[PDB]
Design a protein around this ligand. Structure first.
Ligand SMILES: [Fe+2]
Ligand SMILES: [Fe+2]
Lengths: 382, 382
């Protein structure tokens, strides 16, 4: 089957990539940047940092730090208000996945005029988004390079997936210098989110030789660095490795798509308002076991990439040994042991599974189940 | 580690990607396309095929089939005039490397300045190029996705290099259906060129975890499919694999750069007027032996990727086995035995070695040598 590989045409990486990306704006014509970010990014001073570097280049900026996890239409609308009142001609997301998603929606609407909901689906926008630069500060999401934009309707209580090549940032930035500050908990969660992207992309029915290569490289680098990055966030080599790893994982899932881990995790997070990262982290092992009955061999490929001594094992054993390795890694970095700790409730599963099967990510899972299998899958995670 | 990954926003691949790509143009606003290609692409009907698919989407087109192997400035001027008389609002390159570079220049000068020279260098253009779609028909160049643009101006007899993020095509197309027609010699030469890209990019001092991942995957796929595509150009799986492989090789060298193989090959190709791919092919094994003194370990990684049973060998021994594997491959697909057969004269070595060291690709070769060492390298290649 034919395929399509989406990605920003310019992707800056490594220590110093931030200064470089900002200096390249010289002669771009941009004068007013709308910086979309987290309250935590503005408090630590990262927002000022970017604002100042922009200044030195003669570029002004307005800040909207009202972005919280699970970006909503309200947040998008607020950012659009600031953009309007400042006539921002450029958008810069700063932070983790939430900021990137919110920025993409703001940028798309700014040029397409209408409502977020109108663009839910595949390539619904008629025109390119307002130019957008995405500066990533967590090592697991890759939203700074995907053509995905997921915004939550707070009123209806619904998550809308915008799959549009127009939301692909014009420039992505992955400077590990901005990731050093990630506390151990965040490092572990976003790291597992990235590992999840690798696993799901490699297991996807839309996998291609390119996504395969990226996903495996991501898994390998994660197995080699995540634990290190968690034990000591000052280890620059580890931070940089995780930055390339999460990007490679995005190169894979942005194009092969995901599976049941995210189909489900999107529900737990968007219902209990839990962190995207940790939800996938706790669900991963259980979904892999569920899929092992269909992609045992490929799961073994990932384990080998991860350095596991399973090359001489049959696929079943190799797969089970891989899953066990994921469980061990998760424990070693303190991921919560189950959905019970996450604060999930068995009474909500019937609805969680119901929405899970309707999530855009479910279509590519290797093993397709019914409203009753997904419910039982969920229950097995508590 | 302070790197930049360049690549088109959209890359269509696989059987039928050409039609999918043109179809996505419906409602794009483009009305007049400029199709840049060779004389043999226009005669064989491939141009018409594209022009008709464009008509179905309400897009008219004009054609410029004057592109000669090794793009020239006169060519860029010729295509530029055609664009003027038809008031073209976007460009489409059709063919191998030559058509792509010509189109890139045409599209860049069409919205920026008037002379090609004005853009020689890095990021010289101040404005984006006129929208460009590059449809690749050979399996080894990757010009449809690089930010490189090389144009030879007969006057000074100099090949100007335009390294600009703006010459990166807006959309790349790799449909193996348009590659089935590649005769044996061409698939072998372009195939070996892609292998060289993987080897040089993996050996490059500018390599990153991303380019490494793409390079190894490219070498792996080529090792498993090149011979088959040469023995049976009708085998779609083989052609499909080579399309993906040559793209991956591009994802790698466009970002990590190359080495002494191309530095040297570019001299033979110019100071003898020989095909790019074949010069690289014959040279490759020799340069690898030379670089082995510094990157033995990495050469072994490529050999393992290529499916060689050398995992239990030392790096020095693995590299030699990999180098021998390259020699065996080249021979099995009809690549000349040495420079003597290419029509090169030993008395030209001093001159060839001097310009090789002056080549831009020389800077990233893992082993740096002087005039003497290079002259010797060349001679040992006879
Ligand atoms: Fe995720
Ligand atoms: Fe080449």
């Amino acid at each position: 089957a034919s395929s399509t590989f989406y990605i920003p045409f310019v992707n800056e990486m490594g220590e110093g990539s931030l200064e470089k990306a900002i200096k390249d704006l010289n002669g771009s014509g941009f004068k007013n940047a709308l910086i979309v970010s987290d309250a935590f990014m503005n408090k630590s001073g990262v927002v000022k940092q970017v604002a100042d570097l922009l200044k030195a280049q003669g570029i002004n900026s307005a800040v909207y730090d009202g972005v919280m996890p699970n970006p909503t239409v309200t947040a998008v609308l607020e950012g659009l208000k600031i953009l309007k009142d400042n006539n921002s001609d450029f958008v810069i997301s700063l932070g983790g996945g939430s900021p990137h998603d919110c920025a993409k929606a703001i940028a798309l609407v700014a040029t397409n005029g209408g409502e977020v909901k109108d663009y839910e689906g595949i390539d619904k926008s008629k025109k390119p988004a307002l130019p957008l630069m995405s500066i990533n500060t967590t090592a697991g999401t890759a939203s700074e390079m995907t053509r995905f934009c997921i915004i939550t309707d707070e009123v209806r209580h619904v998550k809308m997936a915008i799959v549009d090549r127009h939301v692909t940032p014009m420039v992505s930035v992955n400077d590990p210098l901005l990731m050093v500050g990630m506390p151990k908990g965040l490092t572990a969660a976003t790291g597992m989110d990235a590992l999840t992207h690798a696993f799901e992309a490699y297991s996807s029915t839309a996998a291609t030789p390119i996504t395969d290569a990226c996903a495996l490289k991501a898994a390998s680098m994660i197995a080699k660095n995540l634990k290190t990055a968690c034990d000591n966030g000052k280890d620059m080599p580890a931070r940089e490795a995780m930055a390339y790893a999460q990007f490679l994982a995005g190169m894979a899932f942005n194009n092969a798509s995901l599976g049941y881990v995210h189909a489900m995790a999107h529900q737990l997070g968007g219902y209990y308002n839990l962190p995207h990262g940790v939800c996938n982290a706790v669900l991963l092992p259980h979904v892999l076991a569920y899929n092992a009955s269909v992609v045992a061999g490929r799961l073994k490929d990932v384990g080998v990439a991860m350095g596991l001594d399973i090359a001489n094992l049959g696929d079943k054993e190799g797969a089970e040994a891989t899953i066990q390795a994921v469980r061990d890694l998760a424990a070693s970095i303190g991921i919560p042991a189950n959905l019970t700790e996450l604060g999930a409730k068995k009474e909500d599963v019937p609805l969680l599974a119901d929405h899970a099967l309707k999530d855009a990510c479910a279509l590519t899972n290797p093993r397709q189940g019914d409203q009753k299998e997904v419910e039982e899958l969920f229950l097995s995670a508590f």
